[model samples]
Target: RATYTVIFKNASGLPNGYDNWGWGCTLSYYGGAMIINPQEGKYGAVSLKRNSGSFRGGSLRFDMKNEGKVKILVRNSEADEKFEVETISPSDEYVTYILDVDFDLPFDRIDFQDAPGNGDRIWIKNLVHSTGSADDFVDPI
Candidate 1:
């Protein structure tokens, strides 16, 4: 996907309509391609987890279109002050959302609530079914 500039990344669990029309799951970052940092409002984060366990859970989704109402800030990290997710009534086309993946402590990192500007066009997809396994206690810590 273009010699990987700043592509998407990994961590799975995405089932449930798969965006209702199309289906997707392909990411790359440091390994290569990870672009889309418009650098406007200054914010970035979208992660998922689920291929069955190492830490905690998975769930992430997005299908969007715009012309008028645009406000989407869903944070999972950076302190998560209010757990943001905003999308005001502005449209000329699509809108679909389903997200839930918040982990902390021993789980490491996966947190970024939001960041998009006026000319919004967000269509992230496939991030489903997690919280499967992890939390071992073989002989009690």
Candidate 2:
């Protein structure tokens, strides 16, 4: 089996014990992903957390399609705010994203949030979370 863990795979559900943290929005599963239909313009958000432990210095990956900009949060502990933020714009087409890290990036749980009620919704799947070192990751491309 692969050394890495699958935090999310297909539309089955948030796998690997991920806890749902969506607020002011509706979270559903269909079309091979989690569909987040959030309220417009009021910080309506969609997110998830691990809450067991934190991880860092490895690789992270997932597939997402979003209407507007999305905020990514990573943290070392429950309240550390390690990755205060990173924003990426995913199109209507499914985009696979890979993130490389050193000791610099650490987080137990990760989140994908909406920005200013940009557009429609979010479709996400295939979350690959790693526990091994950076070298353990192989780029599928």
Candidate 3:
């Protein structure tokens, strides 16, 4: 179980200036899967799991500032390509979103990005299972 901070400020393929993803937790699933969960804004986390013939990806319980303008990508280590999720935008109000992803393609990473800058946070108090042991689950106590 490890951790990292993705400000999204000094990264390529992103909008620029204050257009950062902010602080978030990194989770690795059974396979070589990884996800970045923003600590502010929607305050949510990302999850990845192995599906029938492909890997299914989606976000857990999240309240986005706006449903629209959020991008999710999955990178497969075995290949050199990734999948970009094409979904509708989020509403201005707070709501839960469930996204289906196809990560069987190819790439070397999985990342989440948003258009907004600050005021985004994800409370990972008891959410350690996403990064480690299957039997290990963080409970908010």
Candidate 4:
């Protein structure tokens, strides 16, 4: 409904289209290790891409809780080193993360991975990508 199109989002009990999405670590939903509670929008990891075209400049918006630190991994055609956004700490309350980026080369995907401390939890929702400004994204009430 906003300016950006939705690349992916969580369904009631399942992460709608995330089954085929890539993941570095084991994606789980049991034993309190990592769970996906759609009611709370919980997730252990997320890796997804655009279907047809690449995003030029856009904002990634999402709400998260109990996440100690998050790493945003971006893929591009530049150097030997990897491009990433590191050490982003979110508050206990759900926060909308607005990421605006410009890639030197055309890239189509982003991987959002989180490493939570023991007894800590990580959940996210309202995942969206927008070519519009950060103002285009809004937090849920």
Cα lDDT, all candidates? 0.30, 0.69, 0.35, 0.52
Q: Where does candidate 1 have its weakest 10-residue lDDT segment? A: 1-10
- TM-score per model over all chains: 0.21, 0.78, 0.34, 0.60
True-structure lDDT of candidate 1: 0.30
Error of 3 at 48 (Å): 11
At residue 11, give the lDDT of candidate 1: 15
**By lDDT, who's the top model here?**
2
Off by over 4 Å in 4: 1-3, 12-21, 28-45, 76-82, 115-121, 135-141
Clashing pairs for predicted structure model 4, backbone only: none
Model 2 CA deviation exceeding 4 Å by range: 1-3, 101-106, 131-136, 139-141
Q: How do the residues 27-105 of candidate 4 rate in per-residue lDDT, one tens digit apiece?
A: 4443212232211223234555445556655567665564456666555423423346444686677666777655455
Report the lDDT tens digits of candidate 3 across residue range 52-141.
123333222222334335555555645546567543354555343333444445323434554353323221111111222223323221
- Stretches of candidate 3 off by over 4 Å are 1-61, 88-90, 105-108, 115-141
Per-residue lDDT tens digits for candidate 2, residues 88-127, read 7769898987765454745775667777674468888887
Write the residue-wise lDDT of candidate 1 on 30-85 in tens digits. 22222122223533333332222233333334334333344433222334332333
lDDT of 1 at 45: 35
